[PDB]
Amino acid sequence: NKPIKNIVIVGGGTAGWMAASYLVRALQQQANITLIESAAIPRIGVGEATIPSLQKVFFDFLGIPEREWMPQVNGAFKAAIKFVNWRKSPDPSRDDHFYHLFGNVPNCDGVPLTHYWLRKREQGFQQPMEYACYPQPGALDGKLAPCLSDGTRQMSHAWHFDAHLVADFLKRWAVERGVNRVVDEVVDVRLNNRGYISNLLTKEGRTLEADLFIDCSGMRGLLINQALKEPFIDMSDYLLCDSAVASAVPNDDARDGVEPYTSSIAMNSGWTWKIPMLGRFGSGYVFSSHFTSRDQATADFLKLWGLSDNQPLNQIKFRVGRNKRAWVNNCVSIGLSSCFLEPLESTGIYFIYAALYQLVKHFPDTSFDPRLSDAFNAEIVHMFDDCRDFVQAHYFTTSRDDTPFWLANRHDLRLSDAIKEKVQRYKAGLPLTTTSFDDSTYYETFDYEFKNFWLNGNYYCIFAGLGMLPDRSLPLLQHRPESIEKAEAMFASIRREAERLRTSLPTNYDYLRSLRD
Amino acid sequence: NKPIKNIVIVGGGTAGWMAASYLVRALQQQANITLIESAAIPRIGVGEATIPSLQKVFFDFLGIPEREWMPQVNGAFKAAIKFVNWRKSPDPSRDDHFYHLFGNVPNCDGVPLTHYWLRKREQGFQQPMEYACYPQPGALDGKLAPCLSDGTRQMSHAWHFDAHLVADFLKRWAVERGVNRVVDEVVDVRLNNRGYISNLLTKEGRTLEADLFIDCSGMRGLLINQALKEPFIDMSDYLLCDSAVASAVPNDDARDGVEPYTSSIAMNSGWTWKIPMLGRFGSGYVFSSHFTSRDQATADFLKLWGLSDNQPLNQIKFRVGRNKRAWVNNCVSIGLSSCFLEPLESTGIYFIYAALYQLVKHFPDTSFDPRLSDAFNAEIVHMFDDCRDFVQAHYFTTSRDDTPFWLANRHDLRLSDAIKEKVQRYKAGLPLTTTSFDDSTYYETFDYEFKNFWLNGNYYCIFAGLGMLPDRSLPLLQHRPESIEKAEAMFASIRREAERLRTSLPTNYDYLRSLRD
Ligand SMILES: Cc1cc2nc3c(=O)[nH]c(=O)nc-3n(C[C@H](O)[C@H](O)[C@H](O)COP(=O)(O)OP(=O)(O)OC[C@H]3O[C@@H](n4cnc5c(N)ncnc54)[C@H](O)[C@@H]3O)c2cc1C
Ligand SMILES: Cc1cc2nc3c(=O)[nH]c(=O)nc-3n(C[C@H](O)[C@H](O)[C@H](O)COP(=O)(O)OP(=O)(O)OC[C@H]3O[C@@H](n4cnc5c(N)ncnc54)[C@H](O)[C@@H]3O)c2cc1C
Ligand SMILES: [Cl-]
Ligand SMILES: [Cl-]
Secondary structure (H helix, E strand, O other): OOEOOEEEEEOOOHHHHHHHHHHHHHOOOOOEEEEEEOOOOOOOOOOEEOOOHHHHHHHHHHOOOHHHHOHHHOOEEEOEEEEEOOOOOOOOOEOOEEEEEOOOOOEEOOEEHHHHHHHHHHOOOOOOHHHHHOOOHHHHHOOEOOEOOOOOEOOOOEEEEOHHHHHHHHHHHHHHOOOEEEEOOEEEEEEOOOOOEEEEEEOOOOEEOOOEEEEOOHHHOHHHHHHOOOOEEEOOOOOOOOEEEEEEEEOOHHHHOOOOOEEEEEOOOEEEEEEEOOOEEEEEEEEOOOOOOHHHHHHHHHHHHOOOOOOOOEEEEOOOEEEOOOEEOOEEEOHHHOEEOOHHHOOHHHHHHHHHHHHHHOOOEOOOOHHHHHHHHHHHHHHHHHHHHHHHHHHHOOOOOOOHHHHHHHHOOOOOHHHHHHHHHHHOOOOOOOOOOOHHHHHHOHHHHHHOOOOHHHHHHHHHHOOOOOOOOOHHHHHOHHHHHHHHHHHHHHHHHHHHHHHHOOEHHHHHHHHHO | OOEOOEEEEEOOOHHHHHHHHHHHHHOOOOOEEEEEEOOOOOOOOOOEEOOOHHHHHHHHHHOOOHHHHOHHHOOEEEOEEEEEOOOOOOOOOOOOEEEEEOOOOOEEOOEEHHHHHHHHHHOOOOOOHHHHHOOOHHHHHOOEOOEOOOOOEOOOOEEEEOHHHHHHHHHHHHHHOOOEEEEOOEEEEEEOOOOOEEEEEEOOOOEEOOOEEEEOOHHHOHHHHHHOOOOEEEOOOOOOOOEEEEEEEEOOHHHHOOOOOEEEEEOOOEEEEEEEOOOEEEEEEEEOOOOOOHHHHHHHHHHHHOOOOOOOOEEEEOOOEEEOOOEEOOEEEOHHHOEEOOHHHOOHHHHHHHHHHHHHHOOOEOOOOHHHHHHHHHHHHHHHHHHHHHHHHHHHOOOOOOOHHHHHHHHOOOOOHHHHHHHHHHHOOOOOOOOOOOHHHHHHOHHHHHHOOOOHHHHHHHHHHOOOOOOOOOHHHHHOHHHHHHHHHHHHHHHHHHHHHHHHOOEHHHHHHHHHO
16 A cells, blocks of 8 residues: 555644644654644643653654753643642631642552551541652642752653643744645635545635645544534533633742642632743633633632733633544544543643554554554543543542532533442552552553553542542451551651652742743 | 611621620610521631630620639630740750730839839849749749639739630520521622622521621631622731641640640741640641641641641631721621731730620611721721731741741831831830739720730730840930839839749649639
8 A cells, every 4th residue: 555645734733733743753754744724713822731741752752852842832840730629618717738649659568558548547647648658749838849959850740831832842843854834724625425535725725635634623623523524522411611711820939939730729610720830820710601601700710819800811612522533534633623621630732642642553554444543543532531531530529519510510420330430449448550660660651651541549649639538448458467567668768758858859930940030 | 877686697606606795785775686607617716815805895795704604615724925936946955935924014103114124134134024024924934823722813814715615605695695596508698789788698598688797707708708809908928827737735734734824836937826724735836838838837736746647637727917898888797707817916816806896886877877887997907907016026026047937037027117116116215005004904994905905015025035125225214213223122022922922822723623623
């Protein structure tokens, strides 16, 4: 069969430019790549939070080290997500926060430390799970950097940045490597009688042809949904939010520091993200229009940050769910054209580069063997539905009951068999998937991470944070007092590490400034 | 105009029940009082320290003598606050304590004894000011009662008690006098187009109406802040603490006695209170989250009292400051809904009964003449800001420099013109406000005390305790050697009184037991 040679990508947002750059890098020879993007149709860049695989899977593949790309996108460091007021109805006299940390929890004699922590908790131990089982959360409370001043990594981290600047950085990178950029708008899509895309007609009268089309057109799914009519599986029965109101809010970094984490602050009818950078934070109240009006959500969002009625707001809507198939005929959807999940666990850009990684791992010829696209499609379904369920488990596990929105989350969601089953195992006291690898090894082994994305520690941070604990500790531990003692030595190491970090890390603000103000 | 007849109080904490009982007592006729309080929303009762006006302004007004209410709240006696390690960086080989005593310092020929003490100090006199100028602090060192065994008062005193039990005692008292108690939760507040409160909708579907609403909902300010949108003036530029971690700690009263005073033990990033009762003391490390994590503060608090990781802790947060106005339209805020100051000088419950006293002194009709609420509001601003400044003067005057927290207190606070001016006068050697009245007369004349709350002796105990003394004694004294001699006879009387107290007072523990174990 003849190789795919000509590739057209529709869209110049984060997806389009990630696709152009991943493909120009992967397809060393016999690749002619053209990206078309409209000047009149905006790109989504709200100020975005990410996960460590962005470097290991994406930028490493491009041969771009963190020190090269991060400054160019005015990036800031992210070590966790901090959930605020998710556990109980807000009470201003109570501190309700918990962290979902990067990295994984060690094991002691084949049992994760989370499980030893629960046994201690049964015996009266008061310290929250994540402060017992991870070295860094108090450092995050202190707004400390994830590295020593000399750049020595001290905890797993990812990034906050304006995604517009990342798209810009990759545009520059990809065009320099021979990607053809066309600023123009696709107005019609012509399919042959077999339903493959034949060509694109543009506003300026160009006709684009290709062996392979990548739909990066955003939520409209110009090629995959509009032209090819692939059904979108609306998952609003699983997750209720469908809206956001967002802005950036000036931060006095010198007085207030720069939080080294994303926050998720639970509201009456959704939750607000906070994504710190230098000089400002991005923020958006993600809400369900069925439980609050945009006007009310807007008022709440303003009141939260003490913002004025003159502050310009980005009014957003979305549909949660995914295409029935991501790749149909000669068109692969990547990004918001493929699927959408609310940003509760920073998976949006992940879905872009994970999809790109799988596209190359299933890369077609011009015969478009349906076995390759079937395999790709099943990976995407697994990836998305797994994240959907993990995000949903934040909602149905809360015990907030103060608004109709929280009550509906507790009672009225449709839950997959897969999540029900994971919760059953957790509640029984069983570990969920654990890794034996160091954090470095886990984040360097993407076929492993892709399939084992959410581990025991990820679920524990969420369930324990929300005050939903297993029925009991593992019966096995009653038979292994020496293992319980060994675990105590591990908790002691972790506490030592936390105290060393306290007095060794620069503030996040100082470290960011030293990289370049 | 028609009288206010129907009054609804939201909240059943100390504020709500003080409000119900003060109002049912004051409003002898034409008063229908209903208090609504949620069973699902806790009340603040940490183990609370108070000041002598609680009896003179509050319980006396109700016609309840100390001997009636104190036993019912398992109260213990308080004669002072003892500040530990506030003056210098802690050194375990140095005794760093001083007392802020109740009562006032006498005058000698129109000059307070503090000023004669400073002149002696200039000449080499070693004894600390408060041990020279007050008869009782050595008795407090000896853990002695504030009364003889027969109940004869021997020094000014107030009380330590669990405030839950006081709320309970007043609930009983007020309900017996016709207050209507509703256990239910307000879920919505309806305002008319003019912005007055029209009604309250409750979880159980009741609609509460009233001529006058008293917001005792705690820090959330359900009516005043949430419904009526009155701005809260955040005063975190004035005072840094925003958090506490608290518990009760068993006391072996038979071996260790029961301290007849509250202690304030300065920590790395805040201070710890100690509030003795029979069998236990309440304690809380008040801290600034900007300088320490809750997890670190918790560890420090545990280490301080040798407490175990199984000890249940009350994790508290707060915002220092006050509403811009306490009374808006038909809603008066009282208690934590109105304002908050850290418990450094035991003013929390004071603000409740002082506000109630002023409400009755400015009591409206249904026309809600804004001149009455304006006058009330200005009294509350004066009351709060004056206490804020007095508390703040503990912080900016210390010479501790051992932690970022103490350095920020020394250098980075915003200070009112009023406090700057008082400090200027003190430093110049001038008396601050003095009274000619006996302690009894001062504490029986509340319009006087309310406006002249902190006197020369109060400021001297703090500034002298912190090692910040005036530049010089009063130039006038160089012209009055006979007055200096008369003052010597007064110091001699005080010393005699201290020695008589030594051998005449029962221990606080024995006296408390004799009242009823
Ligand atoms: C509220 C919200 C919050 C988010 N938060 C995060 C987060 O915290 N972390 C994270 O990783 N991700 C997050 N995401 C996801 C992330 O913003 C986007 O997925 C990502 O930035 C890229 O989207 P995209 O490129 O597929 O689409 P878009 O940004 O919508 O870009 C679409 C491109 O297609 C072009 N286009 C459309 N139609 C035509 C046409 N007919 N002809 C020519 N060009 C066309 C447009 O001009 C544009 O260039 C969030 C998303 C939303 C909506
Ligand atoms: C850490 C700390 C230390 C302190 N130390 C001292 C001290 O040493 N000395 C001192 O004098 N004071 C002290 N105080 C102040 C004192 O504890 C409180 O001011 C006082 O006990 C009463 O508070 P409150 O009644 O206004 O609010 P809360 O105790 O918070 O009670 C609020 C009431 O409102 C009800 N409520 C709230 N929302 C609703 C709703 N929507 N519907 C129905 N009911 C509702 C709740 O159920 C509750 O009954 C301290 C305070 C703190 C936080
Ligand atoms: Cl996302
Ligand atoms: Cl107080």
